[PDB]
Design a protein around this ligand. Structure first.
Ligand SMILES: [Ca+2]
Length: 278
């Protein structure tokens, strides 16, 4: 399958070179896999989700995404026009308020909820969690992300938008999840993207077009935008039987586009998410 005039992020993860415009992917498109979007929630009614999105948990007064961030990230995972895995199931876990911020205790509760809720879903191809969040280092947030990962969920987390080393940020610094940095369209590291040895992979994170609240779209930047690309890629590859939840992060790093990024500090992986389609 080919999506013409795709968002540059989609086209980038199906190409060994920048500048292309078509997203090439396998027809399965993540069918049979689930992606928990742990964020501000998902406007599940957005026409771009085609009924493949629903809220399963909220930690606030409403399950409605009053921010747009979680809907944007869910869209990059598996919306029809802006998603990597266009047939995946999307589950919204609202751990962030409508101002985009959430206490650490709530983020931990949301990750433990996903680790349990997956046992009563139908995801025969596997479960992915996309965590477009992050704050200062916390051993308990790292432990929650590690618990979710070891429970059989591929966990992708943002590296953070501080232009610093991701070792000082959670859940970015948890070694056993998949920490995602942000690159731009010209294959540079995004100016804001965190780096460091804990990073596993880079994804398109600058000027990412995806869904938004009110049935609209908008482009935003951040490692929070690169994470759903990788989460969608992991759900996409798990549907093709190429990898499991426990191994998806390494597989995506094994099959990445190596050495293609610029402004990668020494000690940080120079790997760009790539689906190796045909
Ligand atoms: Ca890792």
């Amino acid at each position: 399958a080919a999506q013409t005039n795709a968002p540059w992020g989609l086209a980038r993860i199906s190409s060994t070179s920048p500048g292309t415009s078509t997203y090439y992917y396998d027809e399965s498109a993540g069918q049979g896999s689930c992606v928990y979007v742990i964020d501000t929630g998902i406007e599940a009614s957005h026409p771009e989700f085609e009924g493949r999105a629903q809220m399963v948990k909220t930690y606030y007064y409403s399950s409605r995404d009053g921010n747009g961030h979680g809907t944007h990230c869910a869209g990059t995972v598996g919306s029809r026009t802006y998603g990597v895995a266009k047939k995946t199931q999307l589950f919204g876990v609202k751990v962030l308020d409508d101002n985009g911020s959430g206490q650490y205790s709530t983020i931990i509760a949301g990750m433990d909820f996903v680790a349990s809720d997956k046992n009563n879903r139908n995801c025969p191809k596997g479960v992915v969690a996309s965590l477009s969040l992050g704050g200062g280092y916390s051993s308990s947030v790292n432990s929650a992300a590690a618990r979710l990962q070891s429970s059989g969920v591929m966990v992708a987390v943002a590296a953070g938008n501080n232009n610093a080393d991701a070792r000082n940020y959670s859940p970015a610094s948890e070694p056993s999840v998949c920490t995602v940095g942000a690159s731009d369209r010209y294959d540079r590291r995004s100016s804001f993207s965190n780096y460091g040895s804990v990073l596993d992979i880079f994804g398109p994170g600058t000027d990412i077009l995806s869904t938004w609240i009110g049935g609209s779209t908008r482009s935003i930047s951040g490692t929070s935008m690169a994470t759903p690309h990788v989460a969608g890629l992991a759900a996409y590859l798990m549907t093709l039987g190429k990898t499991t939840a426990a191994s998806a992060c390494r597989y995506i790093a094994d099959t990445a586009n190596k050495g293609d990024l610029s402004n990668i500090p020494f000690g940080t992986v120079n790997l760009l998410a790539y689906n190796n389609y045909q």
